[PDB]
Design a protein around this nucleic acid. Structure first.
Ligand SMILES: [Zn+2]
Lengths: 205, 180
RNA sequence: UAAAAAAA
RNA sequence: UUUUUUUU
């Protein structure tokens, strides 16, 4: 595993999405250190240049989580075959986001967002980035009560449920919780060129 | 309890520094890790009024209340490498406490480029304390641990990644050639 | 007046 | 934080 997964690795990602009927595509390249839990990604919009908040796309970028040596790294062992994951995000105002993704690095993403209110914080871009959220893990399932910061105060809550399934059976770990922090490092006025940074570290429950 | 800007203002130190000229001071970051009941303590010490942060942190460990029973693996990520005399104070304080094991990781090899501060830190890496300069993890460790990683971000998300790598690439080879 | 690199 | 050397 460590001989093929070097301490510095790059990836390429292709996403096809459709939000409220508006279709688009996104091409990106990134780089990071999988064993240290840091990664950066540069994205470019290739079609439809976006009428919605970019923050709903950031939580979709997981193979770069730092794992202790005595904790089996379930996601790293899935390579070179890769894995898949499917995510459903239900926002409190009726917005729904369904995402499917295959990772082989080459990432292929298919995204469908529907039922977002025209006056809601997503379509009106009243969000201020995601708060820190501890996702408890126990295929692999993950549930998040995610909170989106609002410009005028308060939070915009959403229920997220994601299933991660490796293409090759490996040893499953015990109970643990991952602390994750994502940051938007740079973006233009219309969010057509975005760079993202991610830190992720697992801990015992 | 540090600022995200102050991190790169004091830890990031290139061969040819930034646009303001020599606006740099010395910091220390002690991470005492009692493994007995897994009860860690942390703290930063600025280079205070004519008392180097090494002596300040020694006196802090002194007047904080030790427990002579168990052993402590204390890590210490400091911006500027300790000088000659306080390194000897450090090794004399470590010789009196056999239940202490210290790791020293510096960001820049700060010294007066004379002879005394050369062997002043060569005794540490050869007698009690494995002393090497920082790399990627110890910066990333000290980044979120000591410097507050809270809600705001003072436009330093990953700019260190290239500067941390430059500092590693140069000064780690420098410190290895010194230890050799 | 900027900046890349190396030696003690 | 003070010196020496090469290049654009
Ligand atoms: Zn000193």
């Amino acid at each position: 595993n460590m001989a093929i997964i070097k301490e510095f690795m790059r990836f390429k990602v292709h996403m096809e999405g459709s939000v409220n009927g508006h279709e688009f595509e996104i091409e990106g390249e990134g780089e990071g250190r999988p064993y240290e839990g840091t990664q950066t990604a540069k994205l470019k919009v290739t079609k439809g240049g976006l009428p919605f908040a970019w923050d709903i796309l950031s939580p979709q970028f997981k193979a770069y989580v730092k794992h202790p040596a005595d904790i089996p790294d379930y996601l790293k062992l899935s390579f070179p075959e890769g894995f898949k994951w499917e995510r459903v995000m239900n926002f409190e105002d009726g917005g729904v986001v369904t995402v499917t993704q295959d990772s082989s690095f080459i990432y292929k993403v298919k995204l469908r967002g529907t039922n977002f209110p025209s006056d809601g914080p997503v379509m009106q871009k009243k969000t201020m980035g995601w708060e820190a959220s501890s996702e408890r893990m126990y295929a692999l399932k993950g549930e998040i009560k995610q909170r989106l910061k609002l410009k005028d105060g308060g939070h915009y809550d959403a229920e997220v449920k994601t299933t991660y399934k490796a293409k090759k059976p490996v040893q499953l770990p015990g109970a643990y919780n991952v602390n994750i922090k994502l940051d938007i490092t740079s973006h233009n006025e219309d969010y057509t060129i975005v760079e993202q940074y991610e830190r992720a570290e697992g801990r015992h429950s | 309890l540090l600022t995200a800007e102050t991190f790169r203002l004091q830890f990031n130190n290139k061969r040819r520094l930034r646009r303001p000229y020599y606006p740099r001071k010395a910091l220390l970051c002690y991470q005492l890790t009692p493994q007995n009941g897994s009860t860690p303590t942390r703290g930063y010490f600025e280079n205070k009024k004519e008392c180097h942060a090494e002596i300040c942190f020694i006196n802090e460990i002194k007047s904080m209340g030790l427990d002579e029973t168990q052993c402590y693996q204390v890590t210490c990520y400091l911006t500027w490498s300790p000088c000659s005399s306080c390194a000897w104070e450090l090794v004399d304080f470590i010789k009196a406490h056999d239940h202490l094991n210290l790791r020293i990781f510096a960001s820049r090899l700060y010294y007066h480029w004379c002879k005394p501060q050369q062997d002043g830190l060569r005794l540490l890496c050869g007698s009690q304390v494995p002393v090497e300069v920082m790399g990627f993890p110890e910066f990333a460790d000290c980044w979120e641990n000591f410097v507050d990683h809270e809600k705001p971000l003072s436009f330093n998300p990953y700019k260190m990644l290239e500067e941390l790598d430059k500092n590693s690439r140069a000064i780690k080879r420098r410190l290895d050639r010194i230890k050799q």
